Amino acid sequence: GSMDITMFKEDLKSHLEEKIIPFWQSLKDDEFGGYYGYMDFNLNIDRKAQKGCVLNSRILWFFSACYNVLKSEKCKEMAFHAFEFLKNKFWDKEYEGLFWSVSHKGVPVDVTKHVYVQAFGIYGLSEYYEASGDEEALHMAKRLFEILETKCKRENGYTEQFERNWQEKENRFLSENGVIASKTMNTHLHVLESYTNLYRLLKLDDVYEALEWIVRLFVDKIYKKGTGHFKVLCDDNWNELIKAVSYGHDIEASWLLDQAAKYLKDEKLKEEVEKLALEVAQITLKEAFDGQSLINEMIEDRIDRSKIWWVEAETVVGFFNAYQKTKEEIYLDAAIKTWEFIKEHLVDRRKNSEWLWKVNEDLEAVNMPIVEQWKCPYHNGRMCLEIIKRVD
């Protein structure tokens, strides 16, 4: 470590404690349970907004992880609140697994079962089990794992969307021209992430075998060799629908794969993953880091240079991870520069706010919600928590 790294860590911990945690605490829905589902750009909460399961599981994960790292008893209480809503409203008492979305009162809105949702369920529940010791949470996590492996898994990866009763259907994720993507790297990335967390807490051989399997899939099918990029949206055989690169998902994958690699008993696979993770970091830095921040994506030859909150959060973690593995200061420099960028342009300076969704290529704020089914405390919360865990 170093003075810069120490001050960096102190800065993130202060930010987490004084900005992020109090904000998400304010979203607690004491009327019907869970957390309110929407807050607009002008900081107005829609109490009656539909509640997405991914958002609730991400809040569950976040407050659970805050307790596990910071030992905040209030955070544990907030996790409990999210867990109660998960157990009571999102968990399907007939067919098991987690609904996609419910009304603000908990009435099912979309009962279909997506692997993306089940994975975040495992991630959040496993983290909550660590925080609370609640064996009910562990039971549900284990059951979600069982269902993914026995009902959803195929030879090429996971079929991603199902009817409520686990009969397979076509996926809901589309290309920018409206074509259904049967395999998506982001669904499979969150399966890897949740299985890592599960195995960390529950060292079952069954979970180990599944974790190695999905790591192998990333190495053999999803990564595009030597390019530093993963496939994004694919057909059922991992052929790309469109030549597209998601720089945020690349750099996120780099450090999540590196993390999974730590648990691998297969030393050949382990060194392959570690090399892969490093190549992604190197190429992300060269291609996507503009000296200040990371750009978003490139579709064919069309580059989106908007600065998106979660992309910048994952860049900080991924470049810091690259620094730790290489001791090359250029990665550390990039991580800290990205964090100063976030502080200057994405952290909202209004009262009772949090992070902005994005600024455009010229760094002007765009009207987007502060809280939505897809905007959570998970990417930015985890950025802070990761640095805190990594720095002694």
DSSP string covering 156-224, please? Answer: TEE--EE-TTS-B---S-B-TTS-B-SEEHHHHHHHHHHHHHHHHHS--HHHHHHHHHHHHHIIIIIEE
Alpha-carbon distance 208 to 34, whole Å?
32
Bin 238: left if φ > 0, else alpha if -120 < ψ < 50, else beta. left
CA 377 distance to own-chain centroid: 10
CATH of the domain at 128: 1.50.10.10
Phi, psi of 19 (to 5 degrees): -115, -60
Å resolution of this model? 1.7
The owner of tokens 């990371």 is 294
Give start and end residues of each alpha helix (H) in 17-70: 21-25, 53-70
Strand, coil or helix: 109: strand
Alpha-carbon distance 118 to 98, whole Å?
6
Alpha-carbon distance 196 to 193, whole Å?
5
Alpha-carbon distance 215 to 199, whole Å?
13
Phi, psi of 71 (to 5 degrees): 60, 35
Whether the Cβ atoms of residue 138 and residue 128 lie closer than 8 Å to each other:
no
Strand pairing partners for 371?
A: 39
List the determination method. Answer: X-ray
Whether the Cβ atoms of residue 221 and residue 269 lie closer than 8 Å to each other:
no
The owner of tokens 């892969």 is 276
For the record, the structure tokens of 132 come out as 């609370």
Task: Report strand pairing: 297-299 vs 302-304.
Answer: antiparallel
Sign of the CA dihedral with 184 first, then 172, 191, and 358 last? positive
Domain count, the chain: 1
- Domain extent, residue 370, equals 1-392
Phi, psi of 94 (to 5 degrees): -105, -50
Q: How many helices (H) and strands (E) does the chain have?
A: 13, 16
Whether the Cβ atoms of residue 27 and residue 81 lie closer than 8 Å to each other:
no
For the record, the structure tokens of 226 come out as 């030597």
Residues counted in the chain = 392
Alpha-carbon distance 250 to 266, whole Å?
23
Task: Report strand pairing: 183-184 vs 233-234.
Answer: antiparallel
